[PDB]
Design a protein around this ligand. Structure first.
Ligand SMILES: Nc1ncnc2c1ncn2[C@@H]1O[C@H](CSCC[C@H](N)C(=O)O)[C@@H](O)[C@H]1O
Ligand SMILES: [Mg+2]
Ligand SMILES: [Zn+2]
Ligand SMILES: [Zn+2]
Ligand SMILES: [Zn+2]
Ligand SMILES: [Zn+2]
Length: 283
């Protein structure tokens, strides 16, 4: 809707109310830049993928887990016991260190524990699952529309959040004609399969990561975090810090290979401002 019957204050207060109702750590809104009161009030905040028509989810009959049974669950210092890690090359280790941060030597694929595993929810191998721990702020950037930044220092390897949205088909992707601003592009789930062609559209439903902007010099990156032992047509898109992040520093990831820069079928350039900037065109 245009929401013309709602005033600057009413609209902004409604977006704030909407943020307050998110579970886990606080999310704030700020626009010290222009008088855009808030992002779309239609947008919904979800804690897991919102599946759609024709999207076959992983079969819980193909689920397997582990036998590690001790205090705190699975033992960082003994990864060769944990069946959840068998698909890794030697030397097997968990993706996470004693600090609960992704290791510098961890590859693109994180293998987390699942409902099938005997370990409790406090397992070191359920970091993504336990979700965001940092307070975040949706703020108005100078040239790139809305953006997100942390209120707290974040060491490299710190888990931030997952990219959520409607999971949709190629057929559905074509049916949605996307152009205007606050238009997200699609995030292919192509890390493993190609037949699936499942994609994540955060226009109407998503996470705070829906407001993360592109940088050619990013401070966060996507780790494909797999739990379910079926076919991997659907898996978690997990943001971790790849650089130490100052308070109030804009969270940016490299969209290339992940989030599209144009609608599936005039243009606006990259404003990340990095010296290495590739001048990537949007739309
Ligand atoms: N480096 C960059 N330069 C210019 N526009 C950018 C950008 N990174 C992201 N964007 C914009 O952000 C969109 C993705 S959705 C991210 C949040 C968006 N800024 C909003 O206001 O809701 C892109 O389609 C593009 O329009
Ligand atoms: Mg890709
Ligand atoms: Zn475990
Ligand atoms: Zn285990
Ligand atoms: Zn396990
Ligand atoms: Zn750039």
């Amino acid at each position: 809707d245009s929401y013309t019957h709602l005033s600057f204050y009413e609209k902004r207060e409604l977006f704030r109310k909407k943020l307050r109702e998110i579970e886990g750590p606080e999310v704030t809104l700020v626009n010290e830049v222009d008088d855009e009161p808030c992002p779309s009030l239609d947008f919904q905040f979800i804690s897991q993928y919102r599946l759609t028509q024709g999207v076959i989810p992983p079969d819980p009959n193909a689920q397997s887990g582990c036998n590690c049974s001790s205090l705190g669950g699975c033992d960082l210092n003994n990864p060769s016991r944990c069946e959840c890690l068998d698909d890794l090359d030697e030397p097997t280790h968990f993706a996470y260190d004693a600090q609960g941060r992704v290791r510098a030597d961890t590859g693109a694929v994180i293998y987390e524990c699942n409902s099938a595993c005997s370990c409790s929810m406090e397992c070191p191998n359920r970091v993504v699952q336990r979700g965001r721990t940092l307070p975040l702020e949706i703020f108005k950037t100078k040239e790139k529309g809305w953006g997100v930044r942390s209120l707290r220092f974040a060491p490299a390897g710190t888990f931030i959040t997952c990219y959520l949205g409607e999971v949709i088909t190629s057929a559905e992707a074509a049916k949605r004609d996307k152009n205007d601003d606050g238009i997200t592009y699609l995030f292919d789930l192509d890390m493993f399969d190609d037949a699936s062609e499942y994609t994540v559209d955060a226009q109407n439903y998503g996470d705070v990561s829906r407001f993360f902007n592109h940088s050619c010099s990013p401070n966060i990156a996507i780790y494909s975090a797999v739990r379910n032992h079926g076919a991997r047509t659907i898996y978690d898109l997990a943001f971790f810090a790849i650089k130490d992040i100052q308070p109030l520093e804009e969270l940016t990831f490299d969209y290339a290979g992940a989030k599209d820069f144009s609608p599936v079928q005039l243009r606006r350039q990259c404003k990340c401002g990095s010296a290495n900037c590739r001048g990537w065109l949007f739309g």
